[PDB]
Amino acid sequence: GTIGSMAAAPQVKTQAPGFYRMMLGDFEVTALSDGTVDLPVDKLLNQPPAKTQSALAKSFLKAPLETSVNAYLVNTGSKLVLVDTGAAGLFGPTLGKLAANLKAAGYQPEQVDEIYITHMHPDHVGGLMANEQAAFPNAVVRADQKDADFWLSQANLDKAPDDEKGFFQGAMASLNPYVKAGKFKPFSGNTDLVPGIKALASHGHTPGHTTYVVESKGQKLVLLGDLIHVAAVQFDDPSVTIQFDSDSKAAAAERKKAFADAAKGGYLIGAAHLSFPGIGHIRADGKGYRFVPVNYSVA
Amino acid sequence: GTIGSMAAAPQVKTQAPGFYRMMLGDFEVTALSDGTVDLPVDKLLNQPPAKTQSALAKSFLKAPLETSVNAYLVNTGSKLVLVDTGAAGLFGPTLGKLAANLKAAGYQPEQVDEIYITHMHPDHVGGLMANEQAAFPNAVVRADQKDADFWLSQANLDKAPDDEKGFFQGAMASLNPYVKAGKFKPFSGNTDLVPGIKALASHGHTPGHTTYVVESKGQKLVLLGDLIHVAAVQFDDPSVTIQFDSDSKAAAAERKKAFADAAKGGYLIGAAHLSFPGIGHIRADGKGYRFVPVNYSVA
Numbered sequence: 001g002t003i004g005s006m007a008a009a010p011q012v013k014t015q016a017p018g019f020y021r022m023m024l025g026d027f028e029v030t031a032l033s034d035g036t037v038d039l040p041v042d043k044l045l046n047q048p049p050a051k052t053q054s055a056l057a058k059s060f061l062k063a064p065l066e067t068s069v070n071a072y073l074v075n076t077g078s079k080l081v082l083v084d085t086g087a088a089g090l091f092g093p094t095l096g097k098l099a100a101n102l103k104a105a106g107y108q109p110e111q112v113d114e115i116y117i118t119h120m121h122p123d124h125v126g127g128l129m130a131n132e133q134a135a136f137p138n139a140v141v142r143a144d145q146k147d148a149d150f151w152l153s154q155a156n157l158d159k160a161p162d163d164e165k166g167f168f169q170g171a172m173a174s175l176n177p178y179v180k181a182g183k184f185k186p187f188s189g190n191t192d193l194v195p196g197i198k199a200l201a202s203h204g205h206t207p208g209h210t211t212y213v214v215e216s217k218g219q220k221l222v223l224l225g226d227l228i229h230v231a232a233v234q235f236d237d238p239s240v241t242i243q244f245d246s247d248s249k250a251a252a253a254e255r256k257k258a259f260a261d262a263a264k265g266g267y268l269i270g271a272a273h274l275s276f277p278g279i280g281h282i283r284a285d286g287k288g289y290r291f292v293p294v295n296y297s298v299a
Numbered sequence: 300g301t302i303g304s305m306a307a308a309p310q311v312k313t314q315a316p317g318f319y320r321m322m323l324g325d326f327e328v329t330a331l332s333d334g335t336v337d338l339p340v341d342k343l344l345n346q347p348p349a350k351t352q353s354a355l356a357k358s359f360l361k362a363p364l365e366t367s368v369n370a371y372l373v374n375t376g377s378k379l380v381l382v383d384t385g386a387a388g389l390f391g392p393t394l395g396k397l398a399a400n401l402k403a404a405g406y407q408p409e410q411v412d413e414i415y416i417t418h419m420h421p422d423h424v425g426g427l428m429a430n431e432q433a434a435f436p437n438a439v440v441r442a443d444q445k446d447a448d449f450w451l452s453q454a455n456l457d458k459a460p461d462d463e464k465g466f467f468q469g470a471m472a473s474l475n476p477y478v479k480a481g482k483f484k485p486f487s488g489n490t491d492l493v494p495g496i497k498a499l500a501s502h503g504h505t506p507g508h509t510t511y512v513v514e515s516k517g518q519k520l521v522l523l524g525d526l527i528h529v530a531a532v533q534f535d536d537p538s539v540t541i542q543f544d545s546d547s548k549a550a551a552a553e554r555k556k557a558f559a560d561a562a563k564g565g566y567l568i569g570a571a572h573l574s575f576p577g578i579g580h581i582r583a584d585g586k587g588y589r590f591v592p593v594n595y596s597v598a
């Protein structure tokens with residue numbers, strides 16, 4: 001210890017760098033942490049708090065629930081693509097770790113060729129911008145036209161209630177460097193993006209919410225964005241929606257489709273708000289689903 | 300491409316540092332990865348390969364199975380203690396990562412006060428020695444007297460079949476610096492070690508296999524060593540044993556007792572061969588058990 005064996009070295013406390021490497025056929029996937037943030041999931045989920053409390057207890061959890069914010073880097077061998085970008089400073093002092101974690105993972109933001117945005121919530125697009133400038137100076141940003149039409153519209157910002165105006169302001173501030181520079185390239189619905197990566201519409205959580213399907217050599221990873229927020233509730237009961245959903249009915253429907261398809265297909269998913277790295281399989285489990293986190297692997 | 304187009308970015312491939320920080324009351328726990336190693340679990344498990352193949356498929360796995368090798372650092376404030384040490388180079392080129400991961404975690408070997416060994420298999424004690432020297436030059440090493448007297452006895456080496464002689468050679472070489480320097484301190488069965496950490500006999504896997512029970516401010520973590528090897532088989536069916544067990548009957552009995560106790564108590568377990576970081580809760584699930592990995596947390 002510091003003093004004989006009577007006093008240990010001080011506790012270091014800090015977490016390991018938030019990146020996780022996973023091969024997927026010929027492709028290299030790097031899950032990137034933006035950090036975590038506590039969520040009042042009792043208030044946010046669209047069911048009685050008592051039910052949320054019972055469900056959290058089953059999983060040895062309590063509200064407020066420390067919730068991951070993840071993004072996913074894909075190096076296809078010919079392109080470097082990033083799926084989502086975290087919050088930068090749009091959502092409190094515990095997020096915005098992605099820039100540091102990308103560097104820790106061995107890449108620089110100049111190397112990113114394209115960025116695919118699941119949806120234009122602040123915890124997905126915030127990381128696009130630092131000091132009025134593009135954080136990724138060479139990237140083309142792609143998102144669904146229905147999200148661009150909704151979140152980048154001054155009319156919508158103007159009629160939004162005061163506590164929602166921030167989400168539009170954040171989207172505009174985040175996507176503007178790219179739009180001005182001719183590096184925002186929308187798509188409409190299901191779209192081939194770069195070989196091995198496709199946009200799959202999963203509209204509901206937002207109007208243009210998009211899933212990204214990544215596949216190489218028979219190995220498939222479906223990046224689901226915000227089709228789930230609270231694993232301890234919404235695997236067992238996928239019908240439970242959340243206040244953050246623009247269209248709760250559509251959001252539930254999309255989640256159920258995605259879970260059913262993953263169960264049937266036996267492929268990996270990655271989800272922005274599953275515990276970091278947020279990657280795993282899904283199996284059916286009666287009326288709900290069971291998440292099977294990916295086995296730890298090292299090259 | 301256009302003039303001076305750069306080649307596409309090569310894949311980095313290297314994994315993030317294998318450490319995971321977790322607070323346990325006043326104590327800081329650092330799970331340390333020694334790497335992974337593939338195991339032919341279809342052959343090693345004491346049931347027909349078909350049943351193992353079926354179980355693995357259910358969890359989207361297949362043999363050979365990439366198996367984590369974990370150790371656990373605990374900073375109690377008055378002591379820095381390390382539970383197991385990985386393999387160094389005793390079990391191939393994919394292990395022995397503990398030393399680098401300890402450094403990444405913010406500690407040096409010379410800071411470690413005591414080392415508690417669950418059992419003297421190579422993948423638990425190899426990390427004690429480098430260059431015929433103590434890798435941890437201030438530490439007292441502790442293990443069950445029954446394990447010391449089994450593995451560190453020349454008669455048992457010389458009776459062992461050729462393919463098992465390595466385990467005794469490795470144990471002897473790993474412990475020798477400490478034994479020579481008077482820094483190996485055995486215990487016999489259930490023992491208080493330092494405030495907040497106790498040895499709990501869990502004999503079977505080896506003659507002196509020991510569980511370490513860590514507790515602070517009502518928060519308990521039970522470090523189970525090798526009570527489990529193949530989560531995808533042995534949680535659903537704790538009766539299935541493995542060729543690595545010295546006494547398979549006792550091993551199965553100890554595994555069942557520990558799972559039942561953890562389910563009842565609702566406390567955390569950490570296990571050497573559960574996917575890194577190997578920390579979670581256990582709940583009863585019909586005739587077997589379900590592991591609930593800890594939620595990703597960042598200070």
Ligand SMILES: [Mg+2]
Nearest residue numbers: 285289290291
């Ligand atoms: Mg289930």
Ligand SMILES: [Zn+2]
Nearest residue numbers: 121205226244
């Ligand atoms: Zn969202």
Ligand SMILES: [Zn+2]
Nearest residue numbers: 121123226272
């Ligand atoms: Zn989100």
Ligand SMILES: [Zn+2]
Nearest residue numbers: 418420525543
């Ligand atoms: Zn063992």
Ligand SMILES: [Zn+2]
Nearest residue numbers: 420422525571
């Ligand atoms: Zn072992």
